[PDB]
Amino acid sequence: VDEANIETHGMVPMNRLTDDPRWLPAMSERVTRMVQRDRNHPSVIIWSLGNESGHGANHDALYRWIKSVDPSRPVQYEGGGADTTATDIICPMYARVDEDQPFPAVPKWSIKKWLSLPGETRPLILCQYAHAMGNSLGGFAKYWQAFRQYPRLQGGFVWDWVDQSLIKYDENGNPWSAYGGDFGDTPNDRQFCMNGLVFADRTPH
Amino acid sequence: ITDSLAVVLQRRDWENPGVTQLNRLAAHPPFASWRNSEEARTDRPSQQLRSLNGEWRFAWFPAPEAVPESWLECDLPEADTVVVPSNWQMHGYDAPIYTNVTYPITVNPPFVPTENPTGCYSLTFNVDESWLQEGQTRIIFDGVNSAFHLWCNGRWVGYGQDSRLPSEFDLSAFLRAGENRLAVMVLRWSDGSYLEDQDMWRMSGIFRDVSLLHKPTTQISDFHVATRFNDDFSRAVLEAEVQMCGELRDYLRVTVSLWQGETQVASGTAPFGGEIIDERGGYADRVTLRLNVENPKLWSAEIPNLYRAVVELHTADGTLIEAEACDVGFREVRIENGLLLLNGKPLLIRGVNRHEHHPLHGQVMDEQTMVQDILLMKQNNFNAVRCSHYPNHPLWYTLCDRYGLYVVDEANIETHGMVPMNRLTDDPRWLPAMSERVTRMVQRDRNHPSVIIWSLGNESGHGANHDALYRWIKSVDPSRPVQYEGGGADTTATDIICPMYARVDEDQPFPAVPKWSIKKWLSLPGETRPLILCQYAHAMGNSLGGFAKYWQAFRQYPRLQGGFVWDWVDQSLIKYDENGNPWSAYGGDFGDTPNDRQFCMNGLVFADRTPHPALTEAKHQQQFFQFRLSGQTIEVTSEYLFRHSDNELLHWMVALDGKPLASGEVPLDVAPQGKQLIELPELPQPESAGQLWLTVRVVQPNATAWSEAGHISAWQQWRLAENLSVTLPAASHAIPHLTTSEMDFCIELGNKRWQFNRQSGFLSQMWIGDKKQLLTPLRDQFTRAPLDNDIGVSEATRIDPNAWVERWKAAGHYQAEAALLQCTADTLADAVLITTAHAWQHQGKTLFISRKTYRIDGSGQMAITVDVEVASDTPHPARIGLNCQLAQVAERVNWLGLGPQENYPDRLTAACFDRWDLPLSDMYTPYVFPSENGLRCGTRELNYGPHQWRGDFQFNISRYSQQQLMETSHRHLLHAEEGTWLNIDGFHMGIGGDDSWSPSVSAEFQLSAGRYHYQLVWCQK
Amino acid sequence: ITDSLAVVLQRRDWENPGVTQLNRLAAHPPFASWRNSEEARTDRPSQQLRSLNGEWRFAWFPAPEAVPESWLECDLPEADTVVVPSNWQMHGYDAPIYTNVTYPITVNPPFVPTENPTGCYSLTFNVDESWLQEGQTRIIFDGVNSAFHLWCNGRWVGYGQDSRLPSEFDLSAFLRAGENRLAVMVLRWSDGSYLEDQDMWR
Ligand SMILES: Cc1cc(C=O)c(OCc2ccc(O[C@@H]3O[C@H](CO)[C@H](O)[C@H](O)[C@H]3O)cc2)c(-c2nc3ccccc3s2)c1
Ligand SMILES: Cc1cc(C=O)c(OCc2ccc(O[C@@H]3O[C@H](CO)[C@H](O)[C@H](O)[C@H]3O)cc2)c(-c2nc3ccccc3s2)c1
Ligand SMILES: [Mg+2]
Ligand SMILES: [Mg+2]
Ligand SMILES: [Mg+2]
Ligand SMILES: [Mg+2]
């Protein structure tokens, strides 16, 4: 999945820049210039309009731009409820197998319920599931049971591969794995950079 | 030093489609920042919105680098004082350029000639202390062609592109109390010129209003008004989204009220805070107010009911901060089951394309001309207008809102001259420049109910940027369909099949971009969309042939919902001769090269808004009352969708060969889409010879906002009965005498003599007493002075062999010499009979043969019979008749046949059979490019001076020979010849006009029969 | 004079989402410009695509306006030798920031802090006259975070944004035979950073 370098997660709402036409130029260069560079690679099967930036009208514009200039690949985008007009795939992040999380505007339905909502035609492939932060991947079996039972459940992408720990050296030059704040960075989100199936040195969890 | 021309010009922002603006403020609907809401509710002047129109200082330069540094600090001594808004071409500072498709600059995007005419505008003006103590002072340039840098008090403010949308900059940090100086440097050419290749005059300058706007630092920054409905339009919700800028505080509130006249209809109030829209929450700086409206008065072009929405920004204790306002039209535009609906009813678009053009002021628009245009449109049964091909002056949308016209609002993008047309619109590097021309159009005009359809531009092929911006509009504003003709008129970037110059029945199967028959187009597999031509019926010169063929098809096919004629006004400009008499100029008349000559004049009206003959043909075919007659019962059908005929009578005349017999009036009471049957009183039934004709007009007894009392809105004619003449003519007391020379047959009867030349075989002269009657003999004519539609794009330099004029010229039509075959005289009991036969040849090929009999009888009446052969393999001739130059010049022309206006075989539906009496001046049509003109068809009797001709013919009569018209390129160089040129045709070819670059006269109107016959009688009175 | 930092930094092109590049060439799939068809078929190295990876000269500054004009004409004595490619936080010049959702800078688009860490990268390198007698020579920056201005031999070339796609500029009219010097001013923050809020180390 080749993803454009667009994330506006910290805007309030997440929509603020991606729905503004004054940001459509900046956003189009990050989508279009990706397609122009990577369009010949067979490994790329799906284009992504970015991550966690709500759902703005610029998303719908650039979705249709990709469709027009490269019909050979589906386009996906999770923002604004995972099933917007700018996605060919229902690509939720952390939608649970049986339990609904009915957040206002942007609900995370049961992946099994989500398929059968009236008028919903598309496959579902979680762009992110099974958050692997420390001692986790509890209930991972429950996804794959559901994946195998339901044809339109075609799997997902685990979040994620590598702990984003950095090496620091103490006063005597011993290396140790550091996370949020360990460099005087404030504010910070501490451990939440470490979500990997493997440690930073690629040792398996 | 960073404000110096040296630094600002060195970045060359006008040769870089990545920089379309610098420091420009966001677009939005029209603001006035009223500080009293009753002012806002009544749309009275705002003392927070000053105009800077008036006398500015201007200085021209060949290139921006030639502008001295001194001009930022101080006024240039050799500058002139000049009115703004203006186009600097209209003041004479360089030439306007007329080019159609070929760019007026070398195609080398994004670069521009080093020779780039630059307009240096300066203004010294006062600003109150009040505007600088509190709030935000901005300047608004409504239109700058084509790009500009802006200085204020020597400091640099910003840069702007797109010539037809307003550019706004914040001036608060730049202005001082008292005297200030603006410095505006305007470039004729910029990278934006590559998306501004409309077929029009290429001018430049500050050609729309300049204004200062004062707002409080806490302000309404944007507002959007929508109208939802239930199934039967009995309940509506008005949704009003309001966004603000400045410091949000908990005490801030918004009230939006809805008025209809001085009645408050609804009102709501809320603090700021929108719905949750995603995981980060909602817009703290926005609020949406929903008002209920029961039984709303709906907006349409038939009845433009308006409400007014007032948006007050205030505190909770009531203190008003500012108010904005707009007109509201309750209407729904949807496409449903293949039909474009307005309020649940399928529109039938009686459209026209209208440029912003004035023969004196150029591309500067004024209220008087806009209103004159809207009145003339609505008076000729026009429904809708296409803003070809850019956003208009803001006042235009307000006038269509109130007078009632459907508007296609079209983005300022045309790349016609690129090869292929696709080149820039498919290139992602031009997506930004294109997005700002589309998005800023929608942000400004999305509250006008007159706007029912958004257009992505004109003639720019089909690129992936078109698809991107199509989806942008759908996402941002579902209220309105999006249309675009480029790349074959049915691309993925259009909700409407919007072909230009698709014909009714015949396909034009061009590779990649075919124009199918509009009827066939609808039926193509998978195609579900309505079809509304974005341009049809090219009205260049003597044109709109076959107009009736379109409207029959529009009415028969549901999914054919009409089209927009090209176009409304001749883009003529005024020049002054050596004496200072004005004349209408076109392409090349300003030294502009290369140029596209007459192609700028495509209008139903002249530049001064005098109608062409084609306008009534439009008015007749577009009429809202259709008629049928069975017996003496009239079926009236209303094509109005929303109104009853509560301002309409039906006047009816019955006349025998012009003589009126019976009249009457009947009230009209037809429901929309309804019928009314009317039984006429026992009509006159005379045994008298002649054709009995019934004529009905529809008459509006009451004045409207757009029409005077007694305005005629529709008409129709029927032939009721005919009584063939069977009475023998009255006998004569005398026999006409034949005198035979070797050289002439001369015929005498009373005071009258007829001379026939036996070498030429033509009627050489005719005498009444001593007074001779002819200056040129009476000879056959098989040619006409070529119409724009006959010439097409053919020129002396690059001939097009397939144009009609060229096929004629190549076949020798225009240089063919008559060769006398037979010339005999006989004496009968009661008359003399001259029989003739000529062959017209060219380089050995016989093109035409004409066999005549002239029969002069005791009553002084000359009966001429003509029988023509036309070679099957020569091009079908322009006409088949005779012509002569008469000695007489009378002041009036009197005829029984179709009139009163100019009419041709494929453009005579609006004409009515009656006796017409006009001045000879009105028998000539002053087309700016002279051609064949002023024909009237289906005429049985023509009267001029002592002469009468009877028969069944088409004629024109003028002081201008077909030869002079053919050889003269402007109407102002025509001179009255001695006497009067008379063309009488048995048959005359259609004028065409489906387009004007290819043959467009349809087969049924071509003279292909091979043998023709017609009969005249020439008479004295 | 219009290549000076005073003029180029004046425009503050990193605080304006209407300017994401100046003089940048079009994007395209990966090019190598092989002049032998068998080399292209076997994906072997191309003599027309050289790496500039290696030992560059680098100096850190609290804000772009703190960079001395000297630096375009001449290497800074205070500078250090550092390997490229690299992140300057990994060399200890300032802290990497780990924030998930909340932006690491005050949310005030399109503006960024006045105190905007800037990295001044220079490299002196040779160009064979072969390259300048014919054809086009361009520089490829496969990744620069967050935005940068590029000088070659003291003259200004262009500007670029988007930290994860290549920025290419034509250098043919800037290069001379033998010794050349690139001057790359990289800003940590720019209007582009508003679109780069991925939950990772900044
Ligand atoms: C290069 C090119 C473009 C187009 C266009 O696509 C085109 O066909 C339609 C056309 C449209 C607009 C136009 O010029 C004006 O433009 C104005 C402003 O837009 C109005 O819209 C009017 O339409 C109009 O007066 C002129 C021709 C033709 C053709 N040439 C020929 C010549 C001979 C035989 C077949 C063809 S086919 C070529
Ligand atoms: C504003 C907002 C956004 C989202 C997001 O949509 C969100 O819930 C999902 C979420 C996604 C990514 C994330 O951080 C990481 O970021 C990585 C790189 O970008 C990957 O995306 C990974 O997904 C991820 O580990 C953290 C949380 C919540 C919620 N907050 C709370 C708090 C308490 C109770 C319920 C909720 S619901 C709010
Ligand atoms: Mg520019
Ligand atoms: Mg055109
Ligand atoms: Mg920028
Ligand atoms: Mg995130």
Ligand code: NA
């Ligand atoms: Na499955």
Ligand code: NA
């Ligand atoms: Na994380």
Ligand code: NA
């Ligand atoms: Na119809």
Ligand code: NA
């Ligand atoms: Na034209």
Ligand code: NA
């Ligand atoms: Na009536």
